Amino acid sequence: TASTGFAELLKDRREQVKMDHAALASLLGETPETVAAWENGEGGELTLTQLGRIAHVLGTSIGALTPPAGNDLDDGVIIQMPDERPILKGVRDNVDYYVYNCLVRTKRAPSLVPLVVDVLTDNPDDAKFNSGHAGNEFLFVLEGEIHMKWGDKENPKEALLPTGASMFVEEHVPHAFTAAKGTGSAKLIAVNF
Amino acid sequence: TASTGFAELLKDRREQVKMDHAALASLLGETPETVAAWENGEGGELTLTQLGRIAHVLGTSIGALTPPAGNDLDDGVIIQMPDERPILKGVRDNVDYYVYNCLVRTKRAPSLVPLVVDVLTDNPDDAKFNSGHAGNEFLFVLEGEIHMKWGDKENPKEALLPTGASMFVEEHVPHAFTAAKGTGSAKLIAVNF
Amino acid sequence: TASTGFAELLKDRREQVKMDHAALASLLGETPETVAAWENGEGGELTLTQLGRIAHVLGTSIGALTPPAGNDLDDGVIIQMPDERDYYVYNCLVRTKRAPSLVPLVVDVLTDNPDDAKFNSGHAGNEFLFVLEGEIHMKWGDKENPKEALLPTGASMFVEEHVPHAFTAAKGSAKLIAVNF
Amino acid sequence: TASTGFAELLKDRREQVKMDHAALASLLGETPETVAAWENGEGGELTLTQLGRIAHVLGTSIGALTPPAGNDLDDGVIIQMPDERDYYVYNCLVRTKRAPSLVPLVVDVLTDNPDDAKFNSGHAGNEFLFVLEGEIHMKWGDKENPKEALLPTGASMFVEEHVPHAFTAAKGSAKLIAVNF
Ligand SMILES: C[C@H](O)CP(=O)(O)O
Ligand SMILES: C[C@H](O)CP(=O)(O)O
Ligand SMILES: C[C@H](O)CP(=O)(O)O
Ligand SMILES: C[C@H](O)CP(=O)(O)O
Ligand SMILES: [Co+2]
Ligand SMILES: [Co+2]
Ligand SMILES: [Co+2]
Ligand SMILES: [Co+2]
C-alpha cells in the first residue's frame, strides 16, 4: 500500500498543480506512460532519491506523497500482555544506566512510546543527562524512590520522588534519573507523547 | 493577562483585517476611544457575549483573540507528590464504579490527564460503558487483574488483562472496566492525551 | 452562541478532568448551581477576567472553552459582489469564518518614491501577491538593509510569515491583489 | 537531500523507540552495518516498498522519516515574472516549497454555455477566486442539483475544501484569478 498510497497521492498532487502525465514526465525526463504506471501503483521500485526529485518537481514533500502510518487496532483498541514486552539496554555514554521495557504502541499514535524504565544506578553524583528529546514525557514512580535532575547539568534543578509521584517533562528539557542515593534501584513508568 | 493577552491579540486581528479604531468601533456601536482602551488592556470586564460579537465582526473566534493556557513549569518541569493527589468519585449511571486519583497536569499540555484509577466492581456482567471520549488513552494495569470491554456494548470485544499489561484506546471508542470476576478490585494507570 | 458553545465545552472539559460541579465551584467562588447554570447556557455575562480564571483552574485556555468562528457559507461557498466592499487604500474582498486567516485585498499603492517607502513590522500569515496594474517596487527583510525588486504587471510574489515588507510604485501609482492566508 | 534528511529522521525515530542498530536490522533483513550506513546518508537507493517496510517496523509513516519540501525563498520571499509561467487554460503563478498548498493561477474560461459546464469532483484545500475579466457563471455542490451564481468583474468568492465546482462565462469568455491554499 505504500505504492498504492503513492499512486493516489501522486495523482492528486499532479492534479492540484494542473499537470497532465506529459507535463510531469518531461520535467522528470520520463515518458508519460511511466507516470501513468506510477499512478497505477507500479511505483514500488522508485528509490528514495527519485521520490525526492518527484517531490521537488511537484513543489512538496515526500511525506505529502506517501500514505499515513496505517491502522493496527482491533476496533480502535490494541493491547500488550506483560511477557510480550521487549527489552533494550540503556548505556549512557557507556555504563549500564537504564533498562527499557517497552509497552504497547500503535501506528495510529506514532509519538506514543510508553515504557517501564528500570533505573539501575543509585548514585545521584554520577547521573547521566540527556540533551533533551523531541516530545513531552509523563512519568510515574512505580517502585522505590527516584532522584531526578533537570535543566543545566552544570547546576540542575532536582527532586527526590517517592513511589506514586508523577512528573511532566517538556520537550527538549534535558533530564537524568538515578535511584535515591544508596537505595539500589528504582522503577518508573515513562510515557512519551 | 487574559485582558493583556486580549489587548495584544485584538490589536493584531484588527490590523490584519485593515481596520482602524473608528472602523471597528462603528461596526460594534462603540466609540474609537473604547476600542483603544481594550487594546490598552482595559477589556477585562467585557462579557462572553460581547467577546462573541467582537470575534464575529472580526471574522474569527474568541480563541483567536485570547492568549494560550500559560506556563506553570519550573524550568520545563512540574512534579506532583503522592499526597497532593486529588480524589473524585466515579458513579456510572449511579453505582460506585471507579475512584479517580488525579496525577500531575500542566497548562503547557492541557490534554494530558493522567490518573490512577481504582476499579471498584469485580463483576464483568454489570460493566458500565462510556459513550467514548475525545482523545487517546494509554492504560497500564497497576495492580490486580482487569476485565476490559470495548466497542458495541451490545456485543463487545473483551480482554482479561493481568498486572503489567498495557492498552491503547482510540478516541471516541466506548469502553468499560471492572476487576476480573470475583477478584474484588483492581487498579490501573490511565493517561489521556 | 458564545454562551451555548461555552456551555458544552465547559462541560466536556470539567468531565475531562474528572471534576463534578461541586469541585469546580469550590475553585471559582461560586455555588455548584451557578456552575450547572453556565453549562445550561447561562454563562453569557461572565467577564473576560472570569473566563480567564475558569480556564486557569481547568488547566487550559479560554479558546479551548469557546466555540470556533462559525459558518457563514452557503453549502460551502460565500460570494462578494464588487460593490459590497497616506500610503495605501484597501479594497477588502470576500472573507469567511471558516478560514479566518484568509484576508484578500485589492491594494492601491498611491506612492511612487521607493526611498519614501514605509515597512510594516511584519505580520502573521503568508501572503500571495499579484501586480494588477502599473509597476511595483518591492522591499523586504531589514528596513535598514532590505532586499528589493522591480515588479511589472502580471508579476506574482510570496512573502513568508513575519517577514517585514513595503511597496510603492516604481520611481516616477500601482494596483495589486494581495492575499493573506 | 532526501538521503540526508532520512538519515537524521531515521536515527531520531530509532532512538525514540529505544532500538539499537541490531534490533532494527533484525526486523528488515539487513545487517546492523547497513542500518548504520543509512543513518550515514547511504539510504538513497532504498525503494518506496522498502521505505514502507522501514516506517512500518518503526510504527510510523514514510513522511515522518523524510524531510519537508525545503526552502526556495530569498530571505523569506520568492518572485515570478509574468513571462516565466477544452475547458480552461491555466497560467500558473508563483509557487513555493515553504507552503506547498499554495497554488495561484490566472484561469481563462473559454466556454460560455452554463448547461455545458463540467464539475470537478471537488479538491483538497480552500480556494479564493476573483473575476479578473468578463462575467462568470459559477456552479457548486451536487452536479445534479447545484447552486449557481452570476459573478461580474471584480467579484470575489471562496469555495471550501472538497466542495465540487464548475465555471463558464455567462451565457453568450472570462478570466479569473484562483488561489488554492
Ligand atoms: C526517563 C527518561 O526520560 C528515559 P530517556 O528519555 O532519557 O531515554
Ligand atoms: C478508564 C477509563 O478510561 C476511565 P474513563 O475515561 O471512562 O472515565
Ligand atoms: C501597510 C503595511 O505597511 C503593509 P501591509 O498591511 O499591506 O502588509
Ligand atoms: C477544472 C476543474 O474542472 C476545476 P479546477 O481545477 O479549476 O478547480
Ligand atoms: Co526522557
Ligand atoms: Co477512558
Ligand atoms: Co502584507
Ligand atoms: Co478549484
Side-chain angles (χ1 to χ4, degrees), chain A residues 1-7 9-127 129-153 155-193, chain B residues 1-7 9-127 129-153 155-193, chain C residues 1-85 87-117 119-120 122-132 134-160 162-181, chain D residues 1-85 87-117 119-120 122-132 134-160 162-181:
Chain A
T1 21
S3 64
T4 294
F6 170 78
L9 292 170
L10 173 62
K11 183 175 165 57
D12 294 352
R13 181 54 180 180
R14 175 181 59 71
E15 287 180 356
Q16 35 184 303
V17 288
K18 313 311 168 183
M19 298 180 85
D20 57 6
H21 292 183
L24 186 58
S26 69
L27 290 175
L28 291 170
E30 301 278 347
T31 71
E33 292 76 39
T34 286
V35 170
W38 296 341
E39 308 197 320
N40 220 228
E42 291 173 53
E45 291 299 304
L46 295 166
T47 61
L48 170 57
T49 294
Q50 293 177 288
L51 291 170
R53 181 67 208 303
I54 294 175
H56 176 77
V57 175
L58 262 7
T60 186
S61 74
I62 295 182
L65 273 45
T66 41
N71 196 146
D72 48 0
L73 309 174
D74 170 21
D75 285 306
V77 172
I78 186 202
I79 66 165
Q80 180 201 68
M81 298 301 264
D83 72 313
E84 300 186 291
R85 195 180 305 183
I87 63 97
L88 168 288
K89 58 240 61 65
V91 198
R92 212 85 129 189
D93 274 50
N94 307 28
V95 288
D96 276 8
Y97 211 60
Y98 303 144
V99 167
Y100 299 110
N101 302 276
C102 304
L103 298 170
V104 73
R105 294 206 287 279
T106 174
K107 294 197 296 178
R108 295 287 287 187
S111 66
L112 167 59
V113 185
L115 317 153
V116 170
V117 184
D118 310 306
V119 187
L120 309 177
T121 62
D122 78 318
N123 193 296
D125 231 284
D126 283 337
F129 275 74
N130 249 87
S131 309
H133 47 60
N136 301 314
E137 181 175 21
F138 163 71
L139 299 109
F140 181 86
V141 183
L142 248 190
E143 289 165 30
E145 194 197 330
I146 298 263
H147 184 132
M148 157 181 220
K149 290 193 183 180
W150 76 89
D152 186 1
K153 62 167 183 272
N155 176 48
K157 308 308 293 284
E158 304 138 65
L160 272 292
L161 306 167
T163 301
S166 56
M167 314 80 94
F168 172 87
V169 179
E170 196 175 27
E171 58 167 22
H172 307 312
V173 177
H175 49 288
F177 294 105
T178 68
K181 203 252 293 287
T183 54
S185 75
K187 197 172 297 185
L188 54 75
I189 298 183
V191 178
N192 297 285
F193 64 99
Chain B
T1 21
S3 64
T4 294
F6 170 78
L9 292 170
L10 173 62
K11 183 175 165 57
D12 294 352
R13 181 54 180 180
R14 175 181 59 71
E15 287 180 356
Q16 35 184 303
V17 288
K18 313 311 168 183
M19 298 180 85
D20 57 6
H21 292 183
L24 186 58
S26 69
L27 290 175
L28 291 170
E30 301 278 347
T31 71
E33 292 76 39
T34 286
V35 170
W38 296 341
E39 309 197 320
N40 220 228
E42 291 173 53
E45 291 299 304
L46 295 166
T47 61
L48 170 57
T49 294
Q50 293 177 288
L51 291 170
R53 181 67 208 303
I54 294 175
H56 176 77
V57 175
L58 262 7
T60 186
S61 74
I62 295 182
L65 273 45
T66 41
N71 196 146
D72 48 0
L73 309 174
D74 170 21
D75 285 306
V77 172
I78 186 201
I79 66 165
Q80 180 201 68
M81 298 301 264
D83 72 313
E84 300 186 291
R85 195 180 305 183
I87 63 97
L88 168 288
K89 58 240 61 65
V91 198
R92 212 85 129 189
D93 274 50
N94 307 28
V95 288
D96 276 8
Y97 211 60
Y98 303 144
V99 167
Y100 299 110
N101 302 276
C102 304
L103 298 170
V104 73
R105 294 206 287 279
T106 174
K107 294 197 296 178
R108 295 287 287 187
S111 66
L112 167 59
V113 185
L115 317 153
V116 170
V117 184
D118 310 306
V119 187
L120 309 177
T121 62
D122 78 318
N123 193 296
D125 231 284
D126 283 337
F129 275 74
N130 249 87
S131 309
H133 47 60
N136 301 314
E137 181 175 21
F138 163 71
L139 299 109
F140 181 86
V141 183
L142 248 190
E143 289 165 30
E145 194 197 330
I146 298 263
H147 184 132
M148 157 181 220
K149 290 193 183 180
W150 76 89
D152 186 1
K153 62 167 183 272
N155 176 48
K157 308 308 293 284
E158 304 138 65
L160 272 292
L161 306 167
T163 301
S166 56
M167 314 80 94
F168 172 87
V169 179
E170 196 175 27
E171 58 167 22
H172 307 312
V173 177
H175 49 288
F177 294 105
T178 68
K181 203 252 293 287
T183 54
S185 75
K187 197 172 297 185
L188 54 75
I189 298 183
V191 178
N192 297 285
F193 64 99
Chain C
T1 43
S3 58
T4 286
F6 168 78
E8 39 183 280
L9 300 173
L10 167 64
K11 181 180 181 179
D12 287 329
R13 183 50 177 184
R14 178 177 58 70
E15 291 179 349
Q16 171 167 53
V17 290
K18 313 305 162 179
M19 261 186 231
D20 59 358
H21 289 163
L24 181 49
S26 300
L27 306 171
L28 304 168
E30 303 283 351
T31 62
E33 269 58 310
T34 297
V35 182
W38 296 334
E39 270 160 48
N40 201 60
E42 301 173 62
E45 293 307 293
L46 290 165
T47 64
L48 173 64
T49 298
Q50 299 183 76
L51 288 175
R53 164 82 163 298
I54 288 163
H56 172 73
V57 305
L58 284 170
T60 191
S61 71
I62 295 173
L65 301 175
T66 52
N71 197 322
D72 47 23
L73 302 178
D74 180 8
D75 297 347
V77 168
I78 180 164
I79 302 172
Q80 175 192 258
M81 288 305 149
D83 279 82
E84 46 183 308
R85 71 199 171 186
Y87 205 65
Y88 298 156
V89 174
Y90 304 107
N91 297 73
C92 310
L93 274 46
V94 74
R95 229 176 284 158
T96 175
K97 296 205 245 173
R98 295 285 287 171
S101 60
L102 177 71
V103 180
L105 316 161
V106 167
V107 186
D108 271 298
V109 195
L110 18 132
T111 174
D112 69 338
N113 212 307
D115 296 8
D116 277 35
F119 284 62
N120 59 43
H123 54 64
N126 296 329
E127 182 172 355
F128 162 79
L129 291 87
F130 178 79
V131 190
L132 202 63
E135 175 157 52
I136 292 265
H137 190 85
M138 167 181 207
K139 293 187 184 184
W140 74 95
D142 185 42
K143 56 195 290 74
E144 295 79 359
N145 186 225
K147 318 278 295 204
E148 297 177 41
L150 272 296
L151 312 168
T153 297
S156 61
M157 42 272 107
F158 167 89
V159 355
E160 191 166 56
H162 303 102
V163 174
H165 46 296
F167 293 104
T168 78
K171 185 66 175 191
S173 81
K175 175 180 289 292
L176 49 66
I177 178 223
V179 189
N180 305 275
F181 64 109
Chain D
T1 43
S3 58
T4 286
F6 168 78
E8 39 183 280
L9 300 173
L10 167 64
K11 181 180 181 179
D12 287 329
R13 183 50 177 184
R14 178 177 58 70
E15 291 179 349
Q16 171 167 53
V17 290
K18 313 305 162 179
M19 261 186 231
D20 59 358
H21 289 163
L24 181 49
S26 300
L27 306 171
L28 304 168
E30 303 283 351
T31 62
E33 269 58 310
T34 297
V35 182
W38 296 334
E39 270 160 48
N40 201 60
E42 301 173 62
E45 293 307 293
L46 290 165
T47 64
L48 173 64
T49 298
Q50 299 183 76
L51 288 175
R53 164 82 163 298
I54 288 163
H56 172 73
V57 305
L58 284 170
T60 191
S61 72
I62 295 173
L65 301 175
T66 52
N71 197 322
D72 47 23
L73 302 178
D74 180 8
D75 297 347
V77 168
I78 180 164
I79 302 172
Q80 175 192 258
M81 288 305 149
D83 279 82
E84 46 183 308
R85 71 199 171 186
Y87 205 65
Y88 298 156
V89 174
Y90 304 107
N91 297 73
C92 310
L93 274 46
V94 74
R95 229 176 284 158
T96 175
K97 296 205 245 173
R98 295 285 287 171
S101 60
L102 177 71
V103 180
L105 316 161
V106 167
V107 186
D108 271 298
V109 195
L110 18 132
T111 174
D112 69 338
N113 212 307
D115 296 8
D116 277 35
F119 284 62
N120 59 43
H123 54 64
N126 296 329
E127 182 172 355
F128 162 79
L129 291 87
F130 178 79
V131 190
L132 202 63
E135 175 157 52
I136 292 265
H137 190 85
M138 167 181 207
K139 293 187 184 184
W140 74 95
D142 185 42
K143 56 195 290 74
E144 295 79 359
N145 186 225
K147 318 278 295 204
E148 297 177 41
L150 272 296
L151 312 168
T153 297
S156 61
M157 42 272 107
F158 167 89
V159 355
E160 191 166 56
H162 303 102
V163 174
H165 46 296
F167 293 104
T168 78
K171 185 66 175 191
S173 81
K175 175 180 289 292
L176 49 66
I177 178 223
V179 189
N180 305 275
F181 64 109

